Design a protein around this ligand. Structure first.
Ligand SMILES: CCCCCCCCCCCCCCCCCC(=O)OC[C@H](COP(=O)([O-])OCC(O)COP(=O)([O-])OC[C@@H](COC(=O)CCCCCCCCCCCCCCCCC)OC(=O)CCCCCCCCCCCCCCCCC)OC(=O)CCCCCCCCCCCCCCCCC
Ligand SMILES: CCCCCCCCCCCCCCCCCC(=O)OC[C@H](COP(=O)([O-])OCC[N+](C)(C)C)OC(=O)CCCCCCCCCCCCCCCCC
Ligand SMILES: CCCCCCCCCCCCCCCCCC(=O)OC[C@H](COP(=O)(O)OCCN)OC(=O)CCCCCCCCCCCCCCCCC
Ligand SMILES: CCCCCCCCCCCCCCCCCC(=O)OC[C@H](COP(=O)(O)OCCN)OC(=O)CCCCCCCCCCCCCCCCC
Ligand SMILES: CCCCCCCCCCCCCCCCCC(=O)OC[C@H](COP(=O)(O)OCCN)OC(=O)CCCCCCCCCCCCCCCCC
Ligand SMILES: CCCCCCCCCCCCCCCCCC(=O)OC[C@H](COP(=O)(O)OCCN)OC(=O)CCCCCCCCCCCCCCCCC
Ligand SMILES: CCCCCCCCCCCCCCCCCC(=O)OC[C@H](COP(=O)(O)OCCN)OC(=O)CCCCCCCCCCCCCCCCC
Ligand code: HEC
Ligand code: HEM
Ligand code: HEM
Ligand code: HEM
Ligand code: HEM
Lengths: 66, 98, 55, 60, 240, 77, 53, 380, 32, 54, 109
């Protein structure tokens, strides 16, 4: 069974500001993963990416559910 | 400060309703005593100007610009009576001191 | 005057004593009761928890 | 030819008792008419969602 | 992390100023709660007498009440006994005390889902975002057992595993039970359970708006009519 | 106290007409709009600067709060 | 506070009024300790301490 | 034949106070707020009376009783939401009443102003006890916070707050005594408001111009009767659209949970005006100092009539003090927003800057503004 | 003199049926 | 009754009414004394007491 | 200087109502019952305020709350019995009040 949430989310990562936040996300991801021992955890741009993605979802999801 | 005092006079707003400074100063006991000391024509003019002020403020309107009172012709009619009443009050106060 | 004012003074001493007792009565009544005095003095504590923990 | 508010004043509004009577009669009729109007606007703006709209699918 | 994710504003059918709830969605979210959410979360304030006339009919809600068992007493001999529930009975709690809830849910207490929309900021948007925002944690944080990542829960670590998924239950009307559909239905049902007076309140609001839009111009007309004699009064000063 | 001895008024003539003879809304727009912009212009420079600096302090506080919760780039290592 | 409370007449008025004002403050203090049963003052009076309050 | 309206004693009192009452003709919509406050007081009396008819004050049943009012009682949701949003509307009208008095110099009526300050005290205490009545999480925790503030008093506060608590924390005794006090206190408010109206009636009302209005007076009927009716309708519009469309806009979500002595919310955010009081408390970092700061921030209205150094009563003709007054309203709003916000930078520094600005404006800057205005107008 | 007191004009405030002074009332006053 | 017999609703509403109605009694006692002060006070003889009043 | 007792508004109302009220000189002890009724009313106000301060109005807890007032609360038994006997004395004073009113022709007001 297909999921409208997954299709809308895929369109959201296709959107421009979400994919810019996404590229910042994997950039800080290999920044953290390159270091071995640190107390560096970066949830902030993940929050930004989820914020933009879910904002676009809330704009363009509910027309599929009925 | 003639121009600055004129600007502050216009910005105060009581010239817009046709008042005077001595018209619009608040009534303390000395002020009521000096109003009682005002003569008949000045008292009648004061009360009519205040009544017109109440009417204009009720209607949320102001006088026309030509009918606005001007800084050059703002008579200070209540002032000498007010100074005399203040002098009498101060003299009574210093006699109460003694 | 001493006799009359001694009578008046004794009346107001009695009235003041009664009024102080009444007001102290009411403000002690609205104060803490026997239930909350009994439920606070003794606290049940055990040792059935592991080390480095909180309860 | 007297106008409409002229006839209302000549027939009902001059006497205070008749004024109160037409106030009460208009209160009844306006109460029901406004009830019908407001309800009709409500189920037209919310058609297909209320229990009185989806009721027939489970009543019978 | 003290930073929290603000839930987005979903365009609900009841989001409008005069728009009520979709009672079919309320019904669907009710069996979502019954077949999924009722095993952990209690419902202490919603009853079948509130269920009638909103999403189920009286006979359906009655039979739905007798499908579950309710403890009642005292007996003739003075004990408890299990009897079929009725419309007057409230929804059955899964645990008798919150200590049993914490024991069955490894130290986490599932709150009563009868005021959760009015209790959590964001409301049904927060509930939908919480139920649909489950994802793997980012590189940098490790969560111990019994804890799951959720960016919408404050503190980012929730005591719930994802409760819903695709085809988690079978709808009676044949609607495809996707995860988003199930979350939307249960969020609408939780909004109804938090505020059952929603439709009546909005109908009364429409009535109030129309009546006061009729009355305020008329009352202002009487105010200006009675005040007209002052506002057109003219003054003259005629000293000798 | 009551009407009759409130003030001493002389030579003052007041003219008024009946509410049924006159209108409840006499030129409500053609004279209302110049009057309301007159009042707004007269009393706009005493309220608007405090309210706009409240808006500036509000948005600056929110922005500084969000940068305070933002990550410090000093501690890469 | 005010300019009407200056000079020698009110000064000797306060001089005349200060002992009865001090006595009114004193009876206020005695009323306060008697009403509140203030132990910190009631343990120094010679007999009232036998009430244990 | 005689006139019953001046012959009958109850009727002559009603006539002399409400019917043939000489009032200034030019008073604006800001003078409707006293009648709005009285109407809202009566609305809360009736509404809370019904709430107490359907409400029980006991810790394990207070929240259940409130839920039973909301769900099982017919229109009980309407009654409770009317009560809450009408308390919000009551404090809105109270603040606009106080602002009217401050702007138009009505504080020169010393006895009326002091009775108004007493009314403000009683209304704030009543509303605090009403807020703790539904026994929510934030209700219980705000009660504990305010009682600890009372416990900040040296050598009396600990025993005084164990006395007020009826024990050692907020519990069943505290909830029941707060129910009794909340139910009873608006009747003292109504009696003291009768005293308020009597003290106002002794001297007459105040016009926005601040001048002698005896030259131009109108009866209270029917002008101010129909104006007050229109104001009542507008206030009912705002209140009822709040209740029926945004019943939680001025509310608190954490109040919709049962009170837990163990669990605490991450934030303690009471209602708007208590947010103001909480910010003026949180300004300076000491317990007794903050308590005195809150107490002086409320008593500063009673201290206001001694600070009037100007020769003109109202601020209609005083433009500099108009700027100072609107800056005062501005940092009232700022302090309310800081009370809403949590305790970080820059909310702290904005808090004490707003507090010092507010206190310095009321104490120092306003009489200096009046002196400067008088010396510009050749009155000093 | 008291005869100098002439009532000022009110045509900015009159209703539509009482604008002219050459038409008598009682055919419009009851309608108003 | 608030229902079908004397129950919790009846007891709670009677509590509210019993709390509140003595204040209406107090206000009506104020009205009582106001009417009495308007009409004066009576004496046991039932006569005009204005000759001897203290 | 002014006479504050007759110039202050609340104070002149109090003076004209209760201080300088012209009262008949010959009124007997039956005339005290109005003041007794007012004082019993105030006593009922305060005493019932403390009772409702410690009272719960629910059928499961009304009787238990009354027992809690009479036993656990400090001298709440004295408060409850003062309330009950003050109600009884209120009706005693009411009956003697209406007895004075019927006997002495006070119903003409
Ligand atoms: C803009 C277009 C209209 C326009 O030009 O109006 C000019 C007109 C002012 O011109 P004007 O005729 O020279 O002024 C005399 C007033 O109109 C004379 O009327 P007024 O303003 O003195 O009326 C009494 C006052 C009475 O208002 C109150 O009593 C309000 C009480 C406070 C609000 C409620 C409390 C809660 C507040 C929470 C915040 O009412 C108002 O201020 C507005 C009444 C609106 C009625 C409904 C209209 C639809 O303004 C209005 O009529 C205001 C309302 C319309 C805007
Ligand atoms: C008004 C506050 C009254 C406080 C009170 O009565 O306290 C009891 C006490 C009884 O006196 P005490 O000496 O038994 O206790 C004082 C010490 N405390 C209160 C901390 C237990 O009275 C006072 O403290 C008097 C205060 C006067 C100011
Ligand atoms: C004047 C009327 C009262 C006069 C007689 C009673 C005087 C009095 O104070 O009696 C004492 C008694 C309380 O005595 P007790 O509790 O033993 O005191 C020890 C506390 N250290 O006090 C009592 O029993 C209280 C009596 C109260 C009477 C008045 C009630 C007024 C209510 C308002
Ligand atoms: C007013 C505030 C009173 C107050 O805060 O009282 C609290 C205090 C509690 O004391 P208590 O009830 O004895 O409890 C044991 C712990 N002190 O209560 C007390 O200490 C009792 C205070 C009694 C005051 C009586 C005043 C009588 C005045 C009579 C005037 C004539
Ligand atoms: C909102 C702003 C409304 C506004 O425009 O106010 C300006 C108005 C000017 O009125 P004024 O200058 O007196 O004369 C009329 C013009 N010829 O001035 C007024 O209408 C004066 C309004 C006074 C009351 C304002 C209350 C605002 C809320 C204050 C809350 C805090 C008060 C202090 C608490 C401590
Ligand atoms: C000097 C200006 C001259 C303007 C001349 C304009 C043309 C005049 C001739 C044509 C007529 C146009 C219309 C006139 C309208 C009424 C007159 C007017 O606006 O006057 C200017 C007005 C009042 O002038 P006045 O008070 O005399 O200024 C003395 C200097 N203080 O003064 C003003 O408008 C200035 C107000 C400035 C207020 C700035 C406040 C900044 C700080 C706010 C802080 C708020 C709290 C923030 C939080 C604090 C704690 C963190
Ligand atoms: C009571 C016992 C007897 C009291 C007594 O001695 O009464 C005699 C007294 C005489 O009073 P009088 O006639 O004025 O004598 C003046 C002459 N020097 O007579 C009186 O004092 C008469 C007045 C007595 C009032 C109290 C007794 C009646 C109380 C119940 C009244 C009920 C009314 C109805 C209520 C339900 C309706
Ligand atoms: C048993 C596994 C549960 C199921 C089935 C559901 N919930 Fe739950 N819930 C459960 C626990 C143990 C907790 C507490 C976890 C914690 O970390 O505190 C919760 C909590 C919630 C909350 C509250 C979140 C908050 O911010 O307060 C919500 C809104 C919630 N759960 C939603 C929810 C819904 C809608 C469910 C039905 C689909 C549901 N949960 C099922 C345990 C369990
Ligand atoms: C429950 C709260 C209150 C009620 C019911 C109330 C009642 C009233 C009423 C009916 C009026 C007449 C309306 C008017 O003059 O505009 C009035 C005026 C007034 N009120 Fe209040 N009041 C309350 C609180 C306050 C407060 C908090 C203050 C001051 C801090 C205050 C001070 C005044 C003053 C000074 C006036 C005179 C205004 C004037 O003369 O124009 N009152 N009050
Ligand atoms: C005689 C008058 C009043 C009575 C009888 C009364 C009674 C009550 C009762 C029983 C409650 C609890 C019910 C509930 O919260 O659901 C309550 C709540 C409350 N009361 Fe009152 N009250 C009165 C006056 C006031 C006034 C004058 C104010 C404010 C100025 C006020 C403020 C509040 C508030 C804020 C609440 C909380 C409402 C909520 O939490 O939603 N009350 N009142
Ligand atoms: C229920 C509470 C009542 C209160 C608080 C109250 C209060 C008072 C007071 C203070 C007086 C003045 C005392 C005096 O003049 O001797 C008085 C007198 C009077 N009362 Fe009452 N009363 C109450 C009930 C009643 C009742 C039940 C009646 C009759 C059915 C009544 C009828 C009268 C009359 C006629 C007087 C005038 C006595 C006279 O002129 O000598 N009142 N009342
Ligand atoms: C605001 C005023 C009053 C309040 C708050 C109040 C409060 C209460 C409360 C809470 C109770 C139940 C507690 C208990 O009985 O143990 C009660 C009982 C009672 N009340 Fe009141 N009351 C007030 C005035 C009155 C008045 C004026 C009367 C009679 C004239 C009265 C007559 C009674 C009686 C007879 C009982 C029964 C006591 C018993 O059976 O033990 N009350 N009252």
């Amino acid at each position: 069974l297909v999921d409208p949430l997954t299709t809308v989310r895929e369109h959201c990562e296709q959107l421009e500001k979400c994919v810019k936040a996404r590229e910042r996300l994997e950039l800080c991801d290999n920044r953290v993963s390159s270091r071995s021992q640190t107390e560096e955890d970066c949830t902030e741009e993940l929050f930004d990416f989820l914020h933009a993605r879910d904002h676009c979802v809330a704009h363009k999801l509910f027309k599929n559910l009925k | 400060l003639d121009g600055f005092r004129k600007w502050y006079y216009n910005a105060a707003g009581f010239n817009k309703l046709g008042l005077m400074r001595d018209d619009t100063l608040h009534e303390t006991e000395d002020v009521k005593e000096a109003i009682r000391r005002l003569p008949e024509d000045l008292y009648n003019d004061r009360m009519f100007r205040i009544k017109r002020a109440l009417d204009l403020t009720m209607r949320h309107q102001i006088l026309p610009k030509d009918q606005w009172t001007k800084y050059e012709e703002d008579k200070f009619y209540l002032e000498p009576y007010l100074k005399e009443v203040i002098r009498e009050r101060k003299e009574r106060e210093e006699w109460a001191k003694k | 005057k001493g006799f009359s004012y001694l009578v008046t003074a004794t009346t107001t001493v009695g009235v003041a004593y009664a009024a102080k007792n009444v007001v102290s009565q009411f403000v002690s009544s609205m104060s803490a009761s026997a239930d909350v005095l009994a439920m606070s003095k003794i606290e049940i504590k055990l040792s059935d928890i592991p080390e480095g923990k909180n309860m | 030819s007297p106008t409409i508010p002229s006839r209302l004043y000549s027939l009902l509004f001059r006497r205070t008792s008749t004024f109160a009577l037409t106030i009460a009669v208009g209160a009844l009729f306006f109460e029901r008419a406004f009830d019908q109007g407001a309800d009709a606007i409500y189920e037209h703006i919310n058609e297909g969602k209320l229990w009185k709209h989806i009721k027939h699918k489970y009543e019978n | 992390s003290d930073l929290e994710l603000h839930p987005p504003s979903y365009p609900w059918s009841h989001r409008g100023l005069l728009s009520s709830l979709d009672h079919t969605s309320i019904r669907r979210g009710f069996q979502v709660y019954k077949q999924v959410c009722s095993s952990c979360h209690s419902m202490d304030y919603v009853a079948y007498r509130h269920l009638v006339g909103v999403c189920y009919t009286e006979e359906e809600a009655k039979a739905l009440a007798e499908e579950v068992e309710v403890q009642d007493g005292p007996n003739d001999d003075g004990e408890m006994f299990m009897r079929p529930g009725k419309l007057s009975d409230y929804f059955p709690k899964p645990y008798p005390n919150p200590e049993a809830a914490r024991a069955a849910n490894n130290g986490a207490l599932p709150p009563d889902l009868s005021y959760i929309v009015r209790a959590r900021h964001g409301g049904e948007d927060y509930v939908f975002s919480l139920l649909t925002g489950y994802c793997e944690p980012p590189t940098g944080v490790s969560l111990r057992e019994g804890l799951y990542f959720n960016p919408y829960f404050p503190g980012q670590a929730i005591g719930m595993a994802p409760p819903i998924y695709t085809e988690v239950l079978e709808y009676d009307d044949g609607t495809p039970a996707t995860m988003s559909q199930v979350a939307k239905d249960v969020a609408t049902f939780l909004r109804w359970a938090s505020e059952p007076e929603h439709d009546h309140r909005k109908r009364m609001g429409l009535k109030m708006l129309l009546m006061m839009g009729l009355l305020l111009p008329l009352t202002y007309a009487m105010k200006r009519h009675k005040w007209s004699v002052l506002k057109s009064r003219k003054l003259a000063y005629r000293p000798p | 106290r009551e009407f009759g001895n409130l003030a001493r008024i002389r030579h003052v003539i007041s003219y008024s007409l009946s509410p049924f003879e006159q209108r409840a809304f006499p030129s409500y727009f053609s004279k209302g709009i110049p009057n309301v912009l007159r009042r707004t212009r007269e009393r706009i420079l005493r309220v608007a600067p405090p309210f706009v600096v409240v808006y500036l302090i509000y948005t600056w506080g929110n922005q500084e709060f969000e940068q305070s919760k933002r990550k410090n780039p000093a501690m890469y290592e | 506070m005010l300019s009407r409370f200056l000079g020698p007449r009110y000064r000797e008025l306060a001089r005349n009024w200060i002992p009865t004002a001090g006595m009114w403050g004193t009876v206020g203090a005695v009323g306060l300790v008697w009403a509140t049963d203030w132990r910190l003052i009631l343990d120094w009076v010679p007999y009232i301490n036998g009430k244990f309050k | 034949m005689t006139n019953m309206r001046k012959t009958h004693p109850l009727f002559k009192i009603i006539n002399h106070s409400f019917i043939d009452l000489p009032a200034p003709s030019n008073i604006s919509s800001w003078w409707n707020f006293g009648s709005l406050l009285g109407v809202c007081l009566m609305v809360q009396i009736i509404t809370g009376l019904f709430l107490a008819m359907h409400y029980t004050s006991d810790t394990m049943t207070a929240f259940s009783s409130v839920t039973h009012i909301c769900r099982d009682v017919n229109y009980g949701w309407l009654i409770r939401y009317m009560h809450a949003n009408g308390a919000s509307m009551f404090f809105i009208c109270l603040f606009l009443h106080v602002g009217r008095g401050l702007y138009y110099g009505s504080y020169t009526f010393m006895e009326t102003w002091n009775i108004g300050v007493l009314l403000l005290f009683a209304v704030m205490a009543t509303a605090f006890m009403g807020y703790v009545l539904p026994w929510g999480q934030m209700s219980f925790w705000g009660a504990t916070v305010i009682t600890n503030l009372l416990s900040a008093i040296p050598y009396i506060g600990t025993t005084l707050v164990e006395w007020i608590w009826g024990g050692f924390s907020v519990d069943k005794a505290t909830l029941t005594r707060f129910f009794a006090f909340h139910f009873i206190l608006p009747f003292i408010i109504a009696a003291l408001a009768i005293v308020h109206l009597l003290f106002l009636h002794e001297t007459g009302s105040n016009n926005p111009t601040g001048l002698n209005s005896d030259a131009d007076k109108i009866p209270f009927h029917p002008y101010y009767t129909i104006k007050d009716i229109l104001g009542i309708l507008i206030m009912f519009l705002i209140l009822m659209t709040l209740v029926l469309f945004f019943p939680d806009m001025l509310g608190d979500p954490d109040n919709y949970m049962p009170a837990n002595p163990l669990n605490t919310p991450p934030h303690i955010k009471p209602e708007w005006y208590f947010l103001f009081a909480y910010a003026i408390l949180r300004s300076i970092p000491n317990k007794l100092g903050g308590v005195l700061a809150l107490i002086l921030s409320i008593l500063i209205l009673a201290l206001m009539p001694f600070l009037h150094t100007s020769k003109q009563r109202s601020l209609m003709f005083r433009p500099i003090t108009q700027i100072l007054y609107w800056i005062l309203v501005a940092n009232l709003l700022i302090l309310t927003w800081i009370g809403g916000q949590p305790v970080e930078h820059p909310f702290i520094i904005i808090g004490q800057l707003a507090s010092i600005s507010y206190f310095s404006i009321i104490l120092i800057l306003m009489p200096i503004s009046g002196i400067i205005e008088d010396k510009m107008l050749k009155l000093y | 003199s008291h005869t100098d007191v002439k009532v000022p004009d009110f045509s900015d405030y009159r209703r539509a049926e009482v604008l002219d002074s050459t038409k008598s009332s009682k055919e419009s006053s009851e309608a108003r």
